[PDB]
Design a protein around this nucleic acid. Structure first.
Ligand SMILES: [K+]
Ligand SMILES: [K+]
Ligand SMILES: [K+]
Ligand SMILES: [K+]
Ligand SMILES: [K+]
Ligand SMILES: [Mg+2]
Ligand SMILES: [Mg+2]
Ligand SMILES: [Mg+2]
Ligand SMILES: [Mg+2]
Ligand SMILES: [Mg+2]
Ligand SMILES: [Mg+2]
Ligand SMILES: [Mg+2]
Ligand SMILES: [Mg+2]
Ligand SMILES: [Mg+2]
Ligand SMILES: [Mg+2]
Ligand SMILES: [Mg+2]
Ligand SMILES: [Mg+2]
Ligand SMILES: [Mg+2]
Ligand SMILES: [Mg+2]
Ligand SMILES: [Mg+2]
Ligand SMILES: [Mg+2]
Ligand SMILES: [Mg+2]
Lengths: 124, 88, 134, 88, 29, 96, 372, 117, 64
RNA sequence: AUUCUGUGAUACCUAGGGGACGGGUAAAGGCGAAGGCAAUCUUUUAUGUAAAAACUGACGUCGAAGGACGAAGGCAAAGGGAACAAAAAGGAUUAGAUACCCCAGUAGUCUUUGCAGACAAUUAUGAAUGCCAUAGGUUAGAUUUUUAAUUUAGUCUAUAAA
């Protein structure tokens, strides 16, 4: 039996938090903009914190803190949300789900050469 | 694995920050206060012990400065002996 | 039972600070017990001398050994630096090329250690499974 | 395994499990350390844009010298305090 | 005798650093 | 004499390649016999259907370094015999 | 033809300094530390002294006078010189009391060194005219070679796989021709045995035919062959058909020049009580308690295993200075690696009480006050 | 020249192995080669789930064959193997160095030891 | 491998003469059941080695 | 902002397909006449370096011209086309904005056969020979009491005489 997954995708401009079931099927796929954060207000550390708290709160409303015995936390990207959501999952917000986690992995996507990237920017 | 190189001839062998830079302690204590407000709430009850800790630092007196670390003096002595030499 | 248990924890705590494995015949002076010496200031637990030359094995001829290829790659699947291996530039280039041959031939993963080696390591029963989904 | 095959993907290698002596809070520490020793964050930054071969080569020469100089400097700062201990 | 004076100094350092880690462990949670 | 030494070293290899020719397969008869002897359903202790069960793991660095650091313990008696021969075979040159 | 100035330097005291010997050999495949190094098994550099008057000036007969900060004040003036003049124009030295006083401590135990015995205790002295011998002759038979301790050839079991290959291709391979001559001498004597015997009731040793055939007769009996090969390469016997074959020959003298006592079959006559039964006890420390399946104890600078037997079970922070128990050193010997292994044996109760009495710290005096 | 092929056939049938191993074996011997050893590894996981001929596999049946043949023969053994739809993948390597000293020390395929060279 | 028919043949002959099953020291102690068995076996084994080595040392199975 | 998305996107997966790219190793490292060459297997190719012997016996160096090779871009033909991206075009910024920035985007980059011959094609230093005092590293070997020192051929720092 594969544990539930708690993907936390975060980059320079936004953060996505997905909670998939063992078969990797999204159950709660939300983002910072789902809370009302507009164009540039969805990149701040505080916004990522609120998002994580909302997703965790929605998990309790679905009674997932008594339905999930094994959970996995996946961390993709090094955006601000990477540390924000963790403290939400490590503080008082996450305490019924905190003692059900079995794995903690990183899924940052790296290319071994891959395709050519965009040319460097001359900001000056 | 190769060994450390012999430094080239430098104008002066020294360290920028001879003495460690002391970080204001309760700047972290403030972080905890802000954190609790975010999760618990501004007008809550669990923030009392944390808020009271922030008031404790400002009242407390700051420590005294540490004695200077005389490390740049000894580096200047052995400069010509350790490295290739001095340049000017 | 409460005092004994607690005392044991405190005892082991100090045992963790004695960063030294006393052996038979090792001479010790009154200075070897000082904190400056027990601290273990040395930050390098490096290899002694060119393990490859001692065992006298041609790496390129042992591209089959999966455990040997999983020992010179980080858990992420990246060849280890000469600092970690502690080899010569020649032996390093031979082992580096031995890890690229196996990965290039398609008989060893390039982002983690061999699957059969992941089953014998810690977390065997927690390895990420693949639900059929169909 | 016998009934379910292991998911072999790049995240499989970057995985850390929870044990009796290693709780969730501790696994993150082990993860961050292993992710920093493999320079995952650096790679993401270098893969955001393209660096033609020349610029890459020239950038390595500059970074490699600052590492040798720093390593050769740390050995001189400790050789000084070695000779000082002897009383020279 | 000299080992006693040196061993006692190690006990103090050990006790301090041990307490340091304990206080440093309260921040992980 | 210098050219002769090369001939001897070149000959010793042939003598060694000669002694290791007992397990070689030159005819189709030995091939079929060998294949049928090793390629069978219940060959890997079957249970288990892999060489990772009877010979669980291929020799690794930890195991190698342990043969000369951790142990030194009765493998020396087995190892020494193989070594002593190699020394005798070299001097005599007769691949005892 | 040497110049007079060059003849004085040859016999000078400084020129007598021995070369730095290789460090104590350890496992070739380990994770030794580089930045920090602990004391070695045995000393590597020569320890030096000076007069009390010349020490106050820093004069140690070296290139330059040493500093007075770390060279004066101590009771025993000992110092080691790594380099008489380093690239910093300074004599790279260091205190030598770590090994200098350890030798004095060990020499205060009054214990000889004896050859190890497999497990009826027989402590045989190391300095004997039958075992302690290095010189030999080719005519000597194989049996006496076991007695020797300084072999020219290496130990096969000890050599690593890489060292073994190098040895074969650089010491054994270019010796076939000489080995053939060695056999000729043996075959030559074989022909003389029959002749001499029959005469009661040597040849030129040039027969390239019998040699080739002589080696084909020994292919069925490998034992007698190795016995012969060991003499041409001076290899330490390994198979029982024995001495120090478990860990190989001692890299150094069996005593390692730390103690030159032959036997301990003496009874120290105590002033008041009289001839004692055993030797005086020695106080030792406790390192690495059992709770590692063994306990280590520091007996006069050296580290040895604890007696075969609280104190050893668990660590106790309350005890000030550490757990210190009295113990009697029974047997001491040097292993192949060069370490000084001691057979530390639990001490008696009366011995400790008697020995403490002179120190004046005995709680109750056996003399007089003791009614029973 | 001393070569070595590591074929990974489909795990379903043991019979597929014998036929393929014999096909390549008989071929090498006919051309004039000398097979040194044919080890039989079982069925363990592949480096990653791959798809060959509209089929998804997670573990193949490994087998190692160390032989000494010509360049023309080796190339033929490689093409015939690859052409076989029953082989997931192969890995041929010019084992050895080329000198006679090291070429006379290659015996049976080792698993618990190294190829001392 | 810088070999020729002479060196190769001489090595074969030499190699076989050094591994020949040594006959018993005396006739009466000898057992023709074992001796004759080793002879046939050794001969067959030698014939195999010759056929194998000849194929390895062939110059047609080499490279440029 | 243009832009994508209720014709169900982003996010998380499953199963196939398709192109070019080369993570770590990696270093003052190395290889070629230079240009330049960094995943991997087989096949194939000329120099060069070390140590010993043997061999030819001045057979050597430079080299106008001719011919060969020659980065990126470009031309021609047939393929390929994921990504990147001159051009063309749109959205912003600005007093104005061709621009720098952004949404997108064709040649081209890649493969095969030719043309083309210009580069900060640089070590701003033609090639080669003889010769001049040291030190600290480093690369591939060799010798040795292989621990550590001598030594050959390169390479890079810091100096003496100059
Ligand atoms: K969303
Ligand atoms: K869809
Ligand atoms: K020209
Ligand atoms: K525009
Ligand atoms: K040099
Ligand atoms: Mg753009
Ligand atoms: Mg600007
Ligand atoms: Mg492809
Ligand atoms: Mg260039
Ligand atoms: Mg690379
Ligand atoms: Mg070159
Ligand atoms: Mg002539
Ligand atoms: Mg020319
Ligand atoms: Mg072009
Ligand atoms: Mg083109
Ligand atoms: Mg066109
Ligand atoms: Mg674009
Ligand atoms: Mg042209
Ligand atoms: Mg150019
Ligand atoms: Mg020219
Ligand atoms: Mg270079
Ligand atoms: Mg210069």
């Amino acid at each position: 039996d594969e544990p539930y997954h708690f993907h936390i995708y975060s980059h320079k401009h936004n953060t996505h938090i997905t909670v998939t079931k063992p078969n990797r099927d999204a159950l709660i796929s939300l983002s910072c903009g789902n809370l009302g954060f507009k164009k540039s207000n969805r990149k701040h550390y505080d916004s990522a914190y609120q998002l994580g708290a909302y997703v965790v709160d929605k998990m309790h409303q679905m009674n997932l803190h008594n339905k999930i015995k094994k959970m996995e936390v996946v961390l993709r990207g090094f955006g601000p949300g990477r540390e924000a959501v963790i403290k939400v999952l490590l503080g008082n917000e996450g305490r019924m789900l905190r003692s059900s986690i079995v794995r903690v992995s990183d899924a940052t996507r790296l290319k071994f050469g891959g395709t050519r990237s965009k040319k460097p920017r001359r900001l000056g | 694995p190769n060994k450390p190189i012999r430094l080239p001839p430098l104008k002066q062998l020294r360290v920028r920050q001879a003495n460690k830079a002391e970080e204001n302690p309760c700047i972290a204590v403030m972080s905890s206060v802000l954190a609790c407000w975010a999760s618990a709430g501004y007008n809550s009850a669990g923030c009392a012990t944390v808020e009271n800790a922030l008031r404790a630092c400002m009242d407390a007196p700051k420590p005294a400065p540490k004695p200077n670390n005389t490390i740049n003096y000894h580096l200047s002595r052995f400069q010509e002996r350790l490295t290739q030499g001095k340049s000017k | 039972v409460q005092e004994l248990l607690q005392s044991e924890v405190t005892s082991n705590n100090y045992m963790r600070m004695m960063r030294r494995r006393w052996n038979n015949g090792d001479v010790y002076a009154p200075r070897d017990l000082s904190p400056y010496e027990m601290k273990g200031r040395n930050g390098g637990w490096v290899e002694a001398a060119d393990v490859v030359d001692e065992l006298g094995f041609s790496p390129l001829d042992n591209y089959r050994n999966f455990s040997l290829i999983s020992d010179y790659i980080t858990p992420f699947g990246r060849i280890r630096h000469s600092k970690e291996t502690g080899l010569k530039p020649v032996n390093q280039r031979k082992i580096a090329k031995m890890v690229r041959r196996a990965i290039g031939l398609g008989i060893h993963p390039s982002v983690h250690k061999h699957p059969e080696i992941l089953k014998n390591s810690n977390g065997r029963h927690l390895l990420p499974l693949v639900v059929p989904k169909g | 395994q016998q009934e379910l095959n292991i998911r072999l993907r790049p995240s499989t290698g970057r995985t850390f499990y929870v044990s009796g002596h290693q709780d969730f809070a501790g696994a993150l520490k082990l993860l961050h350390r292993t992710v920093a020793a493999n320079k995952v964050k650096k790679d993401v930054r270098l893969q955001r844009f393209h660096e033609r071969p020349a610029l890459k080569r020239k950038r390595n020469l500059r970074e490699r010298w600052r590492a040798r100089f720093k390593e050769g400097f740390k050995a001189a700062v400790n050789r000084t305090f070695e000779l000082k201990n002897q009383g020279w | 005798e000299l080992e006693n004076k040196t061993y006692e100094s190690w006990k103090k350092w050990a006790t301090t650093e041990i307490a340091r880690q304990e206080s440093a462990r309260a921040s992980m949670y | 004499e210098k050219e002769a030494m090369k001939s001897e070293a070149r000959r010793d290899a042939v003598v060694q390649l000669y002694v290791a020719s007992k397990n070689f397969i030159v005819d189709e008869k030995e091939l079929e016999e060998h294949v049928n002897k090793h390629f069978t359903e219940k060959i890997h202790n079957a249970s288990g259907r892999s060489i990772w069960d009877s010979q669980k793991n291929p020799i690794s660095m930890r195991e190698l370094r342990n043969e000369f650091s951790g142990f030194n313990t009765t493998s020396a008696a087995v190892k020494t015999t193989v070594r002593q021969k190699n020394v005798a075979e070299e001097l005599t040159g007769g691949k005892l | 033809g040497v110049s007079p100035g060059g003849a004085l330097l040859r016999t000078s005291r400084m020129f007598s300094l021995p070369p730095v010997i290789p460090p104590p050999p350890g496992n070739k495949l380990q994770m030794i530390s580089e930045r920090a190094s602990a004391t070695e098994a045995y000393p590597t550099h020569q320890v030096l002294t000076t007069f009390e008057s010349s020490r106050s000036r820093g004069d140690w007969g070296l290139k330059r006078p040493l500093p007075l900060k770390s060279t004066t004040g101590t009771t025993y003036p000992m110092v080691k010189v790594k380099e008489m003049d380093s690239l910093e124009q300074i004599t790279d030295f260091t205190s030598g009391t770590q090994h200098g006083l350890t030798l004095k401590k060990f020499q205060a135990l009054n214990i000889p060194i004896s050859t190890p015995s497999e497990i009826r205790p027989v402590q045989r002295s190391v300095f004997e005219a039958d075992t302690d011998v290095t010189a030999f002759s080719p005519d000597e038979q194989i049996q006496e070679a076991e007695k020797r301790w300084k072999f020219s050839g290496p130990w096969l079991a000890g050599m690593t796989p890489g060292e073994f290959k190098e040895y074969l291709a650089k010491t054994v391979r270019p010796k076939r021709a000489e080995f053939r001559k060695f056999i000729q001498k043996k075959i030559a004597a074989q022909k003389t045995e029959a002749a001499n015997r029959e005469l009661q009731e040597k040849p030129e040793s040039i027969t390239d035919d019998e040699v080739t055939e002589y080696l084909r007769r020994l292919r069925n009996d490998n034992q007698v062959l190795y016995d012969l090969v060991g003499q041409f390469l001076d290899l330490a016997p390994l198979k029982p058909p024995s001495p120090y074959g478990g860990r190989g020959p001692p890299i150094t003298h069996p005593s390692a020049g730390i103690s030159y006592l032959r036997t301990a079959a003496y009874l120290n006559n105590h002033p008041i009580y009289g001839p004692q039964k055993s030797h005086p006890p020695v106080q030792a420390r406790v390192l690495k308690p059992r709770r590692g399946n063994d306990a280590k104890i520091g007996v006069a600078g050296f580290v040895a295993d604890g007696p075969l037997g609280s104190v050893m079970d668990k660590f106790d922070p309350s005890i000030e200075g550490g757990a210190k128990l009295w113990v009697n050193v029974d047997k001491a010997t040097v292993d192949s690696t060069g370490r000084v292994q001691l057979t530390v044996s639990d001490a008696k109760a009366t011995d400790v009480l008697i020995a403490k009495e002179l120190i004046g710290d005995a709680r109750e005096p056996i003399f007089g006050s003791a009614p029973k | 020249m001393l070569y070595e092929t590591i074929g990974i056939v489909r795990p379903g049938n043991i019979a597929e192995v014998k036929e393929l191993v014999l096909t390549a074996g008989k071929l090498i011997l006919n051309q004039g080669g000398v097979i040194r050893d044919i080890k039989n590894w079982g069925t363990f996981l592949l480096p990653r789930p791959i798809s060959t001929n509209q089929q998804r596999h997670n573990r193949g049946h490994y087998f190692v064959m160390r032989y000494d043949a010509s360049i023309a023969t080796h190339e033929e053994v490689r093409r015939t193997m690859k052409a076989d739809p029953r082989v997931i993948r192969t890995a041929n390597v010019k084992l050895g160095d080329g000198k006679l000293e090291t070429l006379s020390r290659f015996g049976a395929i080792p698993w618990r030891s190294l190829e001392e060279a | 491998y810088l070999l020729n028919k002479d060196e190769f043949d001489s090595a074969i002959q030499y190699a076989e003469h050094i591994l020949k099953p040594i006959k018993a020291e005396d006739r009466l102690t000898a057992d023709p059941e074992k001796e004759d068995e080793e002879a046939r076996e050794h001969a067959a084994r030698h014939a195999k080695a010759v056929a194998a080595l000849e194929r390895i040392a062939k110059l047609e199975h080499g490279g440029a």
